[PDB]
User: Which sequence fits this backbone?
């Protein structure tokens, strides 16, 4: 309704100056991070207070106008309840109709001495992917068995009234307990964890590189003992979860601070710690590792499909590591090891879900795919599974624990075609597959796989439902980690720490706004 | 502080309700502790922004008026270095 | 940004009662139509005044707060200038790139003794159709020659800085002057006018029905002379423009007021006027005519493609008029006459534009189409025309009167496919046509032709541009007549009449809000 | 009419500007003559709606509060028939 242009007034130079001074005194006297002044919630709140001033003048009783921390806590809690009721039906329907997945993000916090279990629900609505944070549970180290994890998961979904988890596709790392906790459920392995394992194992298995890596660790160990950890500060923030890229972060620590490092070791008489380290070799290792950053980033998105790019990611690793006569031998060996590990660690741990996702990216149909027969069998089975779900649902027999659930212009002008379509029995599952397989779709950079399927829903009634829900399953268990990281302040710092229930309410609400309110 | 003979203005009920909504959305969207609204630096800053509205009206370009995080960091750093 | 639910307060019963009394006294004391209380502009303005009361209390100086009629006039004029500048580039680009059409609506107002010339620009932006009113000129009966009309048209487009009209497809009725005025331009015949002509000629050519039609006119003539015109009031408002459905409106006038009519004629001793009229025959005629209302409605839309439904409309007329043994002979003859006229009047006056539009509705590809060879020739020619326009534009030689005018995720993962596509010369015009012709597209009631082409733009780079722009040409010259009718009050009534320039500014602005501001 | 000792309230400049915008959008969207804003019945109606806002605040359900055209027509007709 922007019928009116809406010009905003730019304040005077002096006002602008006083503004920066007020923001500085806020972050200093209240100990807030500099990024706080950039938040979109912060900006909208400031707009509101300016609006209050315009209506009431400057002499407003501000201490009275401002809500207390207590009232805000209650408000967040009540709003989350309202939003949960608003989308409750949508969530239960996604789960029931085989369209839901959940990423289970687990990490150990050694400072707080607590394990964290983040749970995010993923589904789609037409062309859009939905990612809703359901909970971020802080667990006691002794209450972290497979049984405890399963109990926590059940409790999280029960808070959204989802009691039957049969159809939810879970995406988790390979930790012993999380895997055992979901042994009776559909569970896919996290590609962020797999790729990280490929890298870590490859460096450890190349003795010529494990040597300088060990030497580098000896140096870190010394800088730690000498309280100079801050001297090894790197600007490199990896796309890969911290818990999984210990090697890359360390190498950049040493390399970015090289000249400083050699000086420190010399004046401390600790030169035996640098023996075996070849700076150029370290630089090559970081160059190679940097080439995988984009893969980690692409596999961890949850605003766009990522599952279909797992196979292409494997191909990319092999391309990056292709033999090159210009490589020094230590590097050539590392590359051969990475390729060997891509097969034994990553590929060995993929599932039919991954190959089918790649199959569901139309522009890639013509590419060498070795599992088409298995993919078709899986697709026929999944299309039939949804048809079964719908029949049982119709008779309220789907679950013992979950309660189920003027003529058109075209008919006017095309009466013949219309009656034909009414009398024509729907195309069978195999027919949809055969038509799809022959699709010739052009790769363009603005190609969006979800839109393609959504627009082709009439042509592929059942296959499109399958493709959309399958393509909505994230490739990484750390899909929501960007939000979890932003919430570190309110989950850990004593002065700023909010309670467990409100953390869950706040995260859910934050994801609700992001998904449904622009 | 202490109430004077001429009291500071009390806003309408709708205004109070909206202030709760805006502050709650701030902490949810930006992941801030509920205690951020009771800060002394925070309150003084909010008093300033009310004064800005009293002077320029509702339609102020806020994005332009506010410093970026890096600009703010630099300001805090130079303010600190002033202790020479 | 509807993060907050936003509940609205329902006022008390007594407030609601006073509201209705205030609205009643407004429409009575100021002589406003009842529909004025329902306008969306009216509702938003009332919301604003309630907002003013909430901020300032009840004792606001209202006479001061309200703008004067003069200030409003200036505001409408200045806002229209702002919006014209905002979309000026878009409009000129649509015209230049063969994507623009204009409906020319002409009618004679015998009360005001003035001819009206409405001009509306039509183009598309992705999946959306844009219809912008450029002017509604009130012309003097003596200043209505082909030369005068052409001069007026040039003046209208010059107001939007479009000086070269070469590429604009004009849609007009067959009036002698409007046709001659555009003899050097692309001009398509209005299907509303053609269908109306088919109907009018058919009734006149069926002597058995022309007989009771003449008798009906004799009755109207009498009711007019006796000042009883109000007694012949019908509730039937036809989709077809008033100037074109004289027969249908009259028949319903008599039929709806039958019993009243016979009584009036008897007590006036004018019974010879009803001789030959058979009520059941009249009822059958109105039943048949009512079956065409939907066609007129479907062909006059400008919010959705209509050109592609001209051919199906012709088929529909023939289906409605198909031989039926249950018909009395007068009706059977009428039906044969309508079918004969559909061919000699409507079909004879269609162009390659109409058959191509129908060809461009994918679900109809398999249907009997007799002009495919002509359609292909036309398509190759139009695709090549745009390529020529782009070459000449590149050298600023298109017009002597108009001034011309990190790697992607897909490239990262599909480097092979990406380089191939870069080195692959674009598919030629004939190839796009051949691929299109073999398309198998399912008719569904939610099928939207513009979305189909927009989503298939990469597959059909040139053909989609052609289809989208062609499908955006309205089938009727009266496409904007619904707005023109709403503006009758401000263009004709002395007390409410605004000047010519502001009428144009107001209509353009109204269409701007409708198109670009939700 | 005639100014009294205690004058009626003058609104802010932004408010006056917005009133021009809202009324202009009303006449453009609904196709009303510019002269509709000077009507005596119109002005009395607007005074009423200001009073509604003063009582209930900004967030009134306007669509519910206003009668439909047919309901209004019926009201005018019965008001007329009152002359029996």
Assistant:
């Amino acid at each position: 309704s922007h019928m009116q242009s809406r010009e905003l007034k730019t304040v005077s130079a002096d006002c602008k100056k006083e503004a920066i001074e007020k923001c500085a005194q806020w972050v200093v006297r209240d100990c807030r991070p500099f990024s706080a002044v950039s938040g979109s919630g912060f900006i909208d709140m400031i707009k509101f207070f300016i609006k209050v001033k315009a209506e009431y003048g400057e002499h407003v009783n501000v201490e009275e106008l401002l809500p207390s921390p207590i009232t805000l806590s209650r408000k967040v809690t009540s709003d989350a309840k309202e939003k949960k009721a608003l989308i409750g039906r949508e969530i239960k329907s996604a789960v029931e109709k085989d369209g839901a997945s959940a990423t289970i993000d687990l990490w150990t916090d050694n400072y707080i001495k607590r394990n964290f279990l983040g749970v995010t629900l993923h589904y789609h609505e037409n062309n859009e992917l939905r990612d809703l944070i359901l909970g971020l549970k802080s667990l006691d180290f002794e209450r972290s068995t497979a049984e405890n994890i399963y109990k926590k998961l059940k409790a999280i979904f029960s808070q959204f009234n989802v009691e039957d988890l049969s159809s939810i596709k879970f995406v988790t790392d390979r930790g012993a307990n999380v895997v055992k906790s979901l042994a009776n459920n559909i569970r896919i392995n996290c590609s962020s964890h797999l790729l990280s394992n490929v890298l870590e194992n490859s460096f450890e298995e190349t003795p010529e590189l494990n040597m300088p890596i060990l030497a580098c660790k000896n140096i870190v160990k010394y800088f730690k003992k000498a309280n100079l950890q801050h001297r090894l500060r790197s600007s490199l923030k990896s796309e890969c979860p911290t818990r999984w890229n210990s090697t890359y972060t360390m190498l950049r620590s040493i390399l970015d601070n090289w000249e400083s490092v050699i000086q420190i070791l010399s004046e401390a008489g600790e030169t035996q710690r640098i023996v075996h380290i070849n700076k150029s070799i370290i630089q090559t290792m970081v160059n190679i590792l940097d080439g995988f950053e984009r893969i980690f980033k692409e596999l961890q998105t949850c605003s766009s499909p990522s599952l279909c790019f797992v196979v292409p990611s494997i191909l990319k690793v092999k391309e990056i590591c292709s033999p090159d006569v210009g490589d020094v031998a230590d590097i050539a060996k590392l590359k051969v090891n990475i390729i060997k590990n891509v097969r034994i660690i990553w590929e060995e741990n993929l599932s039919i879900w991954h190959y089918t996702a790649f199959f569901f990216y139309p522009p890639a149909l013509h590419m060498q795919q070795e599992k088409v027969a298995q993919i078709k069998e899986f697709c026929l089975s999944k299309m039939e599974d949804l048809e079964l779900i719908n029949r049982m649902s119709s008779f309220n027999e789907l679950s013992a624990t979950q309660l189920n659930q003027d003529i058109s212009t075209t008919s006017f002008f095309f009466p013949q075609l219309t009656q034909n379509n009414s009398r024509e029995p729907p195309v069978c599952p195999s027919d949809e597959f055969e038509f799809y397989r022959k699709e010739i779709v052009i790769l363009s950079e603005d190609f969006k796989v979800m839109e393609w399927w959504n627009l082709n829903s009439k042509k592929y009634p059942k296959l499109s439902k399958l493709a959309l829900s399958l393509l909505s399953i994230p490739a990484s268990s750390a899909a929501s980690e960007r939000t979890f990281s932003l919430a570190g302040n309110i989950i850990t710092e004593k002065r700023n720490r909010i309670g467990q229930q409100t953390v869950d309410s706040l995260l859910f609400l934050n994801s609700f706004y992001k998904n449904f309110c622009k | 502080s202490h109430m004077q003979s001429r009291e500071l203005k009390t806003v309408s009920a709708d205004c109070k309700k909206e202030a709760i909504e805006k502050c709650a959305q701030w902490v949810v969207r930006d992941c801030r502790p509920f205690s951020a609204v009771s800060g002394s630096g925070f309150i003084d800053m909010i008093k300033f922004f009310i004064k800005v509205g009293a002077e320029y009206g509702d339609h102020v370009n806020v994005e332009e008026l506010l410093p970026s995080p890096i600009t703010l960091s630099r300001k805090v750093t130079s303010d600190a270095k002033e202790k020479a």
